[PDB]
Amino acid sequence: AGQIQVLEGLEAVRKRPGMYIGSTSERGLHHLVWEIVDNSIDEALAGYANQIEVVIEKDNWIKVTDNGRGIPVDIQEKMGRPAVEVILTSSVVNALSQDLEVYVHRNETIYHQAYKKGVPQFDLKEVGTTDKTGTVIRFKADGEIFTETTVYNYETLQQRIRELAFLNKGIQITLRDERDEENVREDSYHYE
Numbered sequence: 221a222g223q224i225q226v227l228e229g230l231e232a233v234r235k236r237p238g239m240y241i242g243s244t245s246e247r248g249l250h251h252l253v254w255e256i257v258d259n260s261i262d263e264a265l266a267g268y269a270n271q272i273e274v275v276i277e278k279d280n281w282i283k284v285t286d287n288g289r290g291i292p293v294d295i296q297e298k299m300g301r302p303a304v305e306v307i308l309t310s311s312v313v314n315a316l317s318q319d320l321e322v323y324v325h326r327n328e329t330i331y332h333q334a335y336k337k338g339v340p341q342f343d344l345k346e347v348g349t350t351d352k353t354g355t356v357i358r359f360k361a362d363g364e365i366f367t368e369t370t371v372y373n374y375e376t377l378q379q380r381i382r383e384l385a386f387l388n389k390g391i392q393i394t395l396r397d398e399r400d401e402e403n404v405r406e407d408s409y410h411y412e
């Protein structure tokens with residue numbers, strides 16, 4: 221019933237994405253970033269993170285990294301699945317991404333899962349070791365949903381990131397644009 225209900229949730233999001241994110245315009249594209257960043261901000265506000273990095277990667281992938289605890293990876297009684305999998309398969313960003321990847325740094329271990337339109341492509345796997353904690357989310361917006369544009373506007377992101385750093389003092393929030401490897405821009409914000 222768990223896994224069935226995941227799939228039904230993906231279907232509902234992809235059928236009426238504007239009910240979930242406001243629109244499928246440029247504004248809705250950018251909302252995908254805000255949904256992921258808000259999760260990292262909550263982790264900071266809970267006392268566990270103080271650095272968030274947003275990268276616009278080649279081909280308009282987005283990478284969001286925080287230094288929080290890492291999304292949990294323990295197996296749930298309820299879903300029988302790792303917690304990160306449950307959390308990300310109920311994410312609107314995941315449903316509305318043609319591809320999404322997570323890397324969790326937790327328990328001295330690096331865990332990885334990938335998804336397409338929210339569907340896990342393989343079981344969560346240990347891929348390496350670490351002495352840090354935190355979460356990396358990378359996603360590519362689905363052009364089947366975002367039919368006007370899939371290209372992010374640096375100044376739109378910059379504006380709101382600076383605002384979020386001013387509101388959430390003590391969190392360092394960095395924006396980087398790597399889409400043109402010959403001219404990389406980086407703004408980083410850290411209030412008091």
Ligand SMILES: O=C1Nc2ccccc2/C1=C\c1cccnc1
Nearest residue numbers: 259260263288289290291307355
């Ligand atoms: O520490 C975190 N960084 C994130 C980035 C994207 C999505 C979720 C999270 C998160 C923690 C989390 C989110 C939901 C439930 N439990 C833990």
